Nucleic acid binder design. Structure first.
Ligand code: MG
Ligand code: MG
Ligand code: MG
Ligand code: MG
Ligand code: MG
Ligand code: MG
Ligand code: MG
Lengths: 136, 50, 178, 79, 116
RNA sequence: CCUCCUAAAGAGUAACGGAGGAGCACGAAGGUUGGCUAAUCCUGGUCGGACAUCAGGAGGUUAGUGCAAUGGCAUAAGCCAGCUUGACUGCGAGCGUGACGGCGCGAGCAGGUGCGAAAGCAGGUCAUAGUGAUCCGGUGGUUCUGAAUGGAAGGGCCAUC
RNA sequence: CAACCCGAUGCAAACUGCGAAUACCGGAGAAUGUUAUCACGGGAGACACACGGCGGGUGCUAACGUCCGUC
RNA sequence: GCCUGGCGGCCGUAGCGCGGUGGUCCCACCUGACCCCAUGCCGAACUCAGAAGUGAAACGCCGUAGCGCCGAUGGUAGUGUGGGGUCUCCCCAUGCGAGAGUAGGGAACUGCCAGGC
């Protein structure tokens, strides 16, 4: 579970990506996962990864998820004809691109967060990297 | 619908007339309002409107 | 201008020394009484309104201004029109003259009055209190009158603060309670 | 299912962009629905029912901005 | 505001006036005074003027804003705006309910000869 | 048939693409003249409380718009009242939009109206849906025609179902 | 347990207080182009298009897939 | 040239706020109101006849950066033509080049007539 509680329209178009995300430098913690690659997160993934983080940090520490699905992404049934009305919404993906701030940690050692996001990127289509708060 | 096609007639001895509609359902009062009568070439009173 | 004169005379200067105002053209004046008597109900009866009207026209020396409905979506119900009352502000002369029949024959013509509120004030400094029940004062046949009544009354003074709003009114014969 | 339909042409836009031959009454702008996207002004005005910017007397078109807070205002002097 | 009110009221005609490219004769009013001046279509340059404030009328008068005290100014404007060759102009009551002092000076200047 | 996206910042463009509406409504909901301006919250006020009406402050097209949507609207296209019938007749410089049949915008001209002191506004509604070609007939009008002549039937023409 | 609002981070075909390249419309100018341009008239054929590039709906940014625009 | 009014220009670096300031010249409130003319109640507004009063409000000035607003240099995004890589994306030559944000700017600048000095 991790989708918009509401929306003006049930089905959004296809569209596409163009790299270079906006939210780059962490503005909530002192660590986190970076994009480094293009792609879209099936939400369930970002959630599957989130759990990994927790199940490592044990407790102590605040986590962030600047990424969000919000994108419908339909699908067509099995043995069903073609072009007969846009298929119904199946899941919810999260369009991300190079330079995206996936998550953010702070209340934990840099050695922990490090070997915490490594267990996170484990379940991820995009190749993420580690980053620090940095003055700028 | 419920709006019948009403026809206004000139008070003049001419046969010229106008046309429109009315909601007789709630306006059973024959309408009049004066309009131009090409035949007599003069603005006069027009009646008849259920 | 009975009370009116008293203002400029006794009052004003009283405030000019108690508030040390620079110019006389500042001392908070009396800015019309408003009244209202929200008949509410109406809907079914409707007559209790026209009655409230005269019952109001009696008090005020002018003519009642039957109001309508703003929201028209009242929780209860009410439509766009749906009359609910009649403000009927006061006009200088009649206003102060009313400020007479009142404070001298209104609050005085009590029901169980033992002190008037001192928090009927506002922000800019405007007091407005509801009689909670028409004191049956000089109305059409005091006894031979319509079922109950009750209404509101707003003064709305030209004061800049309730604090100064105290001086005014109190500078007169405002019953109050201390 | 329940999804389809559509109006049609209804061009409504600029047909007399900037200066032009500007005849006794071309258009220069038929962007209907509007009244502020192109305000009636200058030697011309009209602004017919569908708000279609008329364009009176012959001349050149202008396309101004004169007036508090944007306010297009199409005007046509004589050429 | 009271002032801000009148303005918007006349802002209308004062637009259908400019648009008409006609020469309007503004008529400002006030408790102790009455004004009137004929401005060019461009509304930038003024052509004539006759206000009760001008001693030339204030003295021979009685009370600036005495109704007929305005009518005087009314014709006064006409006087100037005539020898100058100025005539036939649109009256801009300027949000002022055409009926009293504005009514006067108007029909007054009108009677004085002005065409409108 | 109408509105939006697709539609790549002129027009226009497809799909069993994504969304929502029309088959009407008003003699006032039209015309004009005069005037007015919200929603929402805070404070204070009889019965009045979540919200009836009253007062003050903040606020500023977040209201309203007969009905979808988009665009527009304060000089209000929004609201109220007086007086009215321009929801007139004949024409129309000139344009927009269609393969065509058509459809739309229209200053100004003549006759006559209404509102306004006046400039002026008015040829239906804030605009864009609210619709049916031709034939065959029906009704009124007309000295257009009318098979030897005078009539008439019938036909044309204009209005119209 | 949380709206609203304050600050800090993002998202949009049916969001926009911003905003290009560019296309288009018009005006003037030189050269070049064996009138290329417009109107009218005689004769047509053609209204199954396919792929590749770019912008896209649909499809799984599947298909030598499907549907538009454009070269 | 000082100040004020009417009418426009341009329409936020012209606005909002906060502070000070101005007077019977103008303006403003302000006095009176049977009356002209008004109030779906009200002389509040509109309207008329005008003191006495005062700059309190509004307004007009001047000051002030807290908030709007204007805003580059540079870099980034995008993109027309030519070319290349290649998974849907991107690079190169070359012209065009934002938005945001940064420095900074900024408490309007004006014309016509009139009236007071
Ligand atoms: Mg287009
Ligand atoms: Mg294009
Ligand atoms: Mg409409
Ligand atoms: Mg075919
Ligand atoms: Mg084919
Ligand atoms: Mg094709
Ligand atoms: Mg194919």
């Amino acid at each position: 579970m991790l989708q918009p509680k509401r929306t003006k329209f049930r089905k959004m178009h296809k569209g596409r990506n163009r790299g270079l995300a906006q939210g780059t430098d962490v503005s909530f913690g002192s660590f986190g996962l970076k994009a480094v690659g293009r792609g879209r997160l099936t939400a369930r993934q970002i959630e599957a990864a989130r759990r990994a983080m927790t199940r490592a940090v044990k407790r102590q520490g605040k986590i962030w998820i600047r990424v969000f699905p919000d994108k419908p992404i339909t699908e067509k049934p099995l043995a069903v004809r073609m072009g007969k009305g846009k298929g119904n919404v199946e899941y919810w993906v999260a369009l991300i691109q190079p330079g995206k701030v996936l998550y953010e940690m702070d209340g934990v050692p840099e050695e922990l967060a490090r070997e915490a996001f490594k267990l996170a990127a484990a379940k991820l289509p995009i190749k993420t990297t580690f980053v620090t708060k940095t003055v700028m | 619908g419920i709006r019948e096609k009403i026809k206004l007639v000139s008070s003049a001895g001419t046969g010229h007339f106008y046309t429109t509609t009315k909601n007789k359902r709630t306006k059973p009062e024959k309408l009049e309002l004066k309009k131009f009568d090409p035949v007599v070439r003069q603005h006069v009173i027009y009646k008849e409107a259920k | 201008a009975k009370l009116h004169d008293y203002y400029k005379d006794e009052v004003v200067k009283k405030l000019m020394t108690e508030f040390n105002y620079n110019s006389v053209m500042q001392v908070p004046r009396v800015e019309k009484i408003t009244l209202n008597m929200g008949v509410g109900e109406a809907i079914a009866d409707k007559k209790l309104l026209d009655n409230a009207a005269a019952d109001l026209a009696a008090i005020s020396g002018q003519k009642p201004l039957i109001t309508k409905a703003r929201k028209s979506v009242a929780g209860f119900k009410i439509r766009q029109g749906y009359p609910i009352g009649c403000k009927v502000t006061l006009r200088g002369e009649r206003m102060w003259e009313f400020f007479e029949r009142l404070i001298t024959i209104a609050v005085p013509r009590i029901r169980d009055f033992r002190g008037l509120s001192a928090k009927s004030f506002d922000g800019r400094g405007n007091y407005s209190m509801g009689v909670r029940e028409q004191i049956i004062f000089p109305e059409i046949d005091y006894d031979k009158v319509d079922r109950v009544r009750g209404l509101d009354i707003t003064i709305t003074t030209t004061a800049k603060s309730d604090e100064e709003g105290r001086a005014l009114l109190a500078a007169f014969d405002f019953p109050f309670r201390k | 299912g329940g999804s389809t339909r559509n109006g049609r042409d209804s061009e409504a836009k600029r047909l007399g962009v900037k200066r032009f031959g500007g005849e006794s009454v071309l258009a220069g702008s038929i962007i209907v629905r509007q009244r502020g996207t192109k305000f009636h002004a200058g030697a011309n005005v009209g602004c017919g029912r569908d708000h279609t910017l008329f364009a009176k007397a012959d001349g050149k078109v202008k396309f101004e901005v004169k007036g508090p807070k944007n306010r297009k205002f199409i005007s046509i002097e004589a050429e | 505001d009271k002032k801000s009110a009148r303005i918007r009221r006349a802002t209308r005609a004062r637009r259908k006036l400019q648009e008409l490219g006609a020469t309007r004769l503004v008529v400002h009013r006030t408790p102790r005074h009455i004004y009137a001046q004929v401005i060019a279509p461009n509304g930038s340059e003024v052509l004539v003027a006759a206000s009760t404030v001008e001693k030339a009328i204030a003295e021979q008068l009685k009370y600036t804003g005495n109704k007929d005290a305005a009518a005087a100014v009314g014709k006064a404007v006409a006087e100037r705006a005539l020898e100058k060759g100025i005539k036939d102009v649109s009256f801009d009551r300027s949000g002022f309910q055409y009926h009293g002092r504005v009514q006067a000076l108007a029909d007054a200047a009108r009677e004085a000869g002005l065409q409108f």
